[PDB]
Every structure is written in C-alpha cells, then in structure tokens.
Design a protein around this nucleic acid. Structure first.
Ligand SMILES: [Mg+2]
Ligand SMILES: [Mg+2]
Ligand SMILES: [Mg+2]
Ligand SMILES: [Mg+2]
Ligand SMILES: [Mg+2]
Ligand SMILES: [Mg+2]
Ligand SMILES: [Mg+2]
Ligand SMILES: [Mg+2]
Ligand SMILES: [Mg+2]
Ligand SMILES: [Mg+2]
Ligand SMILES: [Mg+2]
Ligand SMILES: [Mg+2]
Ligand SMILES: [Mg+2]
Ligand SMILES: [Mg+2]
Ligand SMILES: [Mg+2]
Ligand SMILES: [Mg+2]
Ligand SMILES: [Mg+2]
Ligand SMILES: [Mg+2]
Ligand SMILES: [Mg+2]
Ligand SMILES: [Mg+2]
Ligand SMILES: [Mg+2]
Ligand SMILES: [Mg+2]
Ligand SMILES: [Mg+2]
Ligand SMILES: [Mg+2]
Ligand SMILES: [Mg+2]
Ligand SMILES: [Mg+2]
Ligand SMILES: [Mg+2]
Ligand SMILES: [Mg+2]
Ligand SMILES: [Mg+2]
Ligand SMILES: [Mg+2]
Ligand SMILES: [Mg+2]
Ligand SMILES: [Mg+2]
Ligand SMILES: [Mg+2]
Ligand SMILES: [Mg+2]
Ligand SMILES: [Mg+2]
Ligand SMILES: [Mg+2]
Lengths: 88, 71, 115
RNA sequence: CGGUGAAAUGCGCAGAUACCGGGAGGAACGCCGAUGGCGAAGGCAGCCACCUGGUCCACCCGUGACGCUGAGGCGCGAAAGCGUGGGGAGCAAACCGGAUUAGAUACCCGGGUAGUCCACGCCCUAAACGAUGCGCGCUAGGUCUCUGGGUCUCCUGGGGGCCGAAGCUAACGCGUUAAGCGCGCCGCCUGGGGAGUACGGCCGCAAGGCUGAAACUCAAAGGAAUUGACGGGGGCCCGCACAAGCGGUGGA
C-alpha cells in the first residue's frame, strides 16, 4: 500500500503553506502517487480488470483538478506539472 | 429455544482458532457448523466464528465431518 | 471355516436394491447378501421386505461362521434401510451399535442430468 | 450388480457389486448460508498470505464551484463458439445401443466425441431484467434486516426488504430504493406482418455481429383488467358415482 508515513511526506512536499492538508496541488500530488502505485501493480497483474476501472477514475479526476488549475493560476499549473512530470 | 450456546459459555475470543474446548460446542453430532438458530450468535459473530472453525479444522483440531451414531 | 466372535454389518441401500455384507472386526467381508441374491429380479429388490430378507440371509450365513455380535454401519437413504436394521436387530445377533455414514460430497462432481 | 412405471442395452466366474487399506488424477467447495454481503455491469462464496479497486461512519481540519451529463472514441462484457498449446475425474451437444410408442426419428435407460477446466489471443451477443439512464433537491409513517457513530430506553448516518400518507397510473401497481413533485444532460420510440430480412458499409480467422430498409399485405397487432368456460391446477362438499354387497344383461 502506501503507509501513512509515506503519504504524509508527499503532503508536506507539495503543501502550499505549513499545515495545508489538501489544496489543489496536494490533491493532485496524493492522487498522482496512488496512480503510479496502482499502474505499477497493473503491469504485473494485467488481469485485474476491475482495479483498472478505479484507475481511469483516479486519472480522470487528476485531469479535472489540473484542468481547473490551468484556468485558475496557469503558473502554479506549470510548476505542479513539472514538479511531478505529467502530461505525456 | 432448545439451548443457546451463547449463554452456556462465559466470554471468549471468536477469532481464537485454537480454543478447541470452546469451538467443539458450535458443531453438531456431525462436524457440521451449527446454524445461527442454535448458536444464538450475532450476525457479525457468526461470520467470524465461521471462519475461525474453518481455520481450526484445517489445523487438525476440529473435524470436517463426523458420523452419526444412533444414540 | 474360520470363527468370528464379533463383527461388522454394513448396509448399503439404494432406491433400486439393498446389499448387506458382513465383515471381520478388521472390516474384511465374510459373507454377504442382497435383494437379488434372495432371488428377486428388478423393481422388487429395492423393498423393505426384500431388504428384510437380504439382512436375514446375511446374518444366517454369518452365524454359521460363528457370528455372535455385530456393529452396524448403514450407508444411504432408501427403502428398508430401517427394515434391514430391525431385521438384524431381531435376527439373533446382538446389535452393539448403529451408525450412518452416507457419503455427502463437500461439493464435487456434477451429477447426472436427472440428479 | 446396475437400471426403470416395468424393462432391456451394459457390467460380472479374466471374480463385478458390497467391505477394508494403499496410490494417482481432475474438477467443484457440504455445514456456516440468510428471504444476507460486495461489485458499474457481466458477475463474485473451503482456507492462507501477498498485490489491488470501490465504499461507509465519526472529526468538521485543508482546498474554494474545482460541479453534472456525455455524439463519437477507449476499456469491461454470462454461456455457447473460434485458433494454438496443455489438461480430462464427473458431466455431456452430435453420434452409438437399449426401451417406449400407432410411429419416436424425442421425453426414460446404458455408452460416448466436441465441450465443460488452465494459459494466451479472438468472438461481443442475452429475458446482458428492476424488462425502470445518470446526477441533484423536495414530498407522512410503520415494520424486518446487513453495516457504521452517540449524551448508545432511544437518537443519528449508509444499504437491503415488506406495508402504506400525499400524489401518480389504462390498470396491475409505484409510493424517501418513486413509476410522486421539479431542473440538467444522454439514449431510444412513431401501426402489425414482411424482418432483425434485403441492399450498402464496418468489424470478424470462422460461426457470424453492429448499422438497417422498402415493395407488398393486413385492419388490426397490442397492454392491463372483467365475466365465463375449460385444465392430464389446487381446496372443501354431494349423488347407488366408485367401493361393499344381492340379483341380472351380454350366451340360449
Ligand atoms: Mg477404496
Ligand atoms: Mg488420468
Ligand atoms: Mg448492488
Ligand atoms: Mg444477476
Ligand atoms: Mg472546515
Ligand atoms: Mg480563498
Ligand atoms: Mg479560505
Ligand atoms: Mg463523473
Ligand atoms: Mg461521464
Ligand atoms: Mg465473452
Ligand atoms: Mg466459455
Ligand atoms: Mg478451445
Ligand atoms: Mg485442444
Ligand atoms: Mg435412438
Ligand atoms: Mg444419455
Ligand atoms: Mg454417462
Ligand atoms: Mg454527512
Ligand atoms: Mg442503525
Ligand atoms: Mg432505508
Ligand atoms: Mg408498496
Ligand atoms: Mg391513495
Ligand atoms: Mg430521496
Ligand atoms: Mg415514466
Ligand atoms: Mg417506421
Ligand atoms: Mg408498416
Ligand atoms: Mg439489430
Ligand atoms: Mg441476431
Ligand atoms: Mg440482435
Ligand atoms: Mg449485409
Ligand atoms: Mg475477413
Ligand atoms: Mg450493441
Ligand atoms: Mg392479457
Ligand atoms: Mg377442480
Ligand atoms: Mg359395485
Ligand atoms: Mg355379475
Ligand atoms: Mg339374449
């Protein structure tokens, strides 16, 4: 899985200010995690079709948040993407 | 209400798959896991018990099946 | 030839026919009898009377091998399973025990069309 | 022995069935098991550990409208079925044999190949059904149940059922799990047969699938409900109706 300790260090990494338990950047971050983490599982388990379902949902969600941020503050969008290497 | 095995017992661990002397009492004259009707167990309890007995049988302690002796 | 003090009486009743074999306390059969051996042909073997016969002859042949007592094992649902017992019971053999050991699969082979 | 209404085919003196012990193999998991749970659907139950999705409750901490729907696209998709390879206990299309029957060429019985099982790639259909698209707000209650929280008599969330206010409905029924009152967005329908056919196009190794007519022809096709009649449907009751008798007709 992801242990609390692991995920917390992600949070603190992207946190827009001390204590931000969940801004946009943070949500994208934590979500980006869960995706790579799950995608990797799916390279091994190509038959877990059911879990793939949740992956589309996670992915699509990640897009809508970014989509929002692109419109909102296009700079924090560049930042957040580069700082995570996405859109490809 | 013939006899409820919830009452004839103190408190015990339902996840304890080694406590034969307890578990023994939730089976029939055959190895069969008693119905919740005779066990008096909760809805949640019975599912837990259910797994514990299965675990314990596989360990060799409780029987899968018996043979009915006309008593 | 041999002399068998106590023993086993196995009763296997079908819907079609009831067979009774008698064995030594190690389970090796001594004499047996069925409904057809009694001398019945078809439908008639699977009968509380045919079965009362099968049992009686089984213990008859048996007590000639010195048989005295028997533990009883019935396998099956069916007619005159009960008759086979009572026939044994009141045959002249002392009936130590009765048990049912009808094999119930724990869900294995798909059965024939008519189940 | 088996087997059926009865029975034969079959198996058995190369010793079967029944019984005890040993071994191999495949496939499915009794009891728990529920009228229960989970899943978007198809679907999912022995046990264990690993990897993994959805989801509910409390706290009311962070973001600050970031939301809903969705042509096409993309992925999932029971069973049967296709290709290659492995596997094969039980079962079992076709096929072989026994019976039944006016005839069976089916229903019953004994066999049995594909298949059913695993991997990989296809197929992509269904009474794929709640025959009920998704999301949100609003509109009495009662009761049963699975599952969270509380100051746990009871209160408060999320599921699953039954009964019902208002209302809706052609009715049957629905009724806070709406088929009620409303808004958003998608899909679909426009008389029956012809017909899921033809033609064309697309997909497919194939079997075939998706999309889909008209000419013609009928004057209906339909849904629900009512009375009746009938049922090799159920329930209770009656008549010399059967049964229990006594005596006859049928023969002269
Ligand atoms: Mg054996
Ligand atoms: Mg083999
Ligand atoms: Mg559901
Ligand atoms: Mg279903
Ligand atoms: Mg707050
Ligand atoms: Mg702000
Ligand atoms: Mg603020
Ligand atoms: Mg959405
Ligand atoms: Mg959508
Ligand atoms: Mg399929
Ligand atoms: Mg298949
Ligand atoms: Mg194949
Ligand atoms: Mg093959
Ligand atoms: Mg034939
Ligand atoms: Mg057959
Ligand atoms: Mg067969
Ligand atoms: Mg809430
Ligand atoms: Mg509750
Ligand atoms: Mg409810
Ligand atoms: Mg109702
Ligand atoms: Mg009303
Ligand atoms: Mg509502
Ligand atoms: Mg409507
Ligand atoms: Mg038209
Ligand atoms: Mg027309
Ligand atoms: Mg069509
Ligand atoms: Mg078709
Ligand atoms: Mg079609
Ligand atoms: Mg065509
Ligand atoms: Mg082609
Ligand atoms: Mg389609
Ligand atoms: Mg009608
Ligand atoms: Mg009637
Ligand atoms: Mg009469
Ligand atoms: Mg007469
Ligand atoms: Mg005359």
């Amino acid at each position: 899985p992801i242990t609390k300790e692991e995920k917390q260090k992600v949070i603190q990494e992207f946190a827009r200010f001390p204590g931000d338990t969940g801004s946009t950047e943070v949500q994208v971050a934590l979500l980006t995690l869960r995706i790579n983490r799950l995608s990797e599982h799916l390279k091994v388990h190509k038959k877990d079709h059911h879990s793939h379902r949740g992956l589309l949902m996670m992915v699509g969600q990640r897009r809508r948040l970014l989509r929002y941020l692109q419109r909102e503050d296009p700079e924090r969008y560049r930042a957040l993407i580069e700082k995570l290497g996405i859109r490809g | 209400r013939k006899a409820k095995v919830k009452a004839t017992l103190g408190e015990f661990d339902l996840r304890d798959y080694r406590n034969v002397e307890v578990l023994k009492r939730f089976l029939s004259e055959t190895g069969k896991i008693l119905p919740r009707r005779r066990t008096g167990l909760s809805a949640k309890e019975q599912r837990i018990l259910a797994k514990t007995i299965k675990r314990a049988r596989i360990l060799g302690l409780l029987p899968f099946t018996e043979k009915l002796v006309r008593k | 030839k041999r002399q068998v003090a106590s023993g086993r009486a196995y009763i296997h009743a079908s819907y079609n026919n009831t067979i009774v074999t008698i064995t030594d306390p190690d389970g090796n059969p001594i004499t047996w009898s069925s409904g057809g051996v009694i001398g019945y042909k078809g439908s008639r073997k699977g009968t509380p009377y045919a079965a009362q016969l099968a049992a009686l002859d089984a213990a008859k042949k048996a007590m000639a091998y010195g048989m005295q007592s028997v533990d009883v094992i019935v396998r099956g649902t069916g007619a005159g399973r009960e008759q086979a017992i009572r026939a044994l019971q009141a045959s002249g053999l002392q009936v130590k025990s009765i048990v049912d050991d009808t094999p119930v699969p724990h869900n294995g082979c798909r059965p024939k069309k008519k189940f």
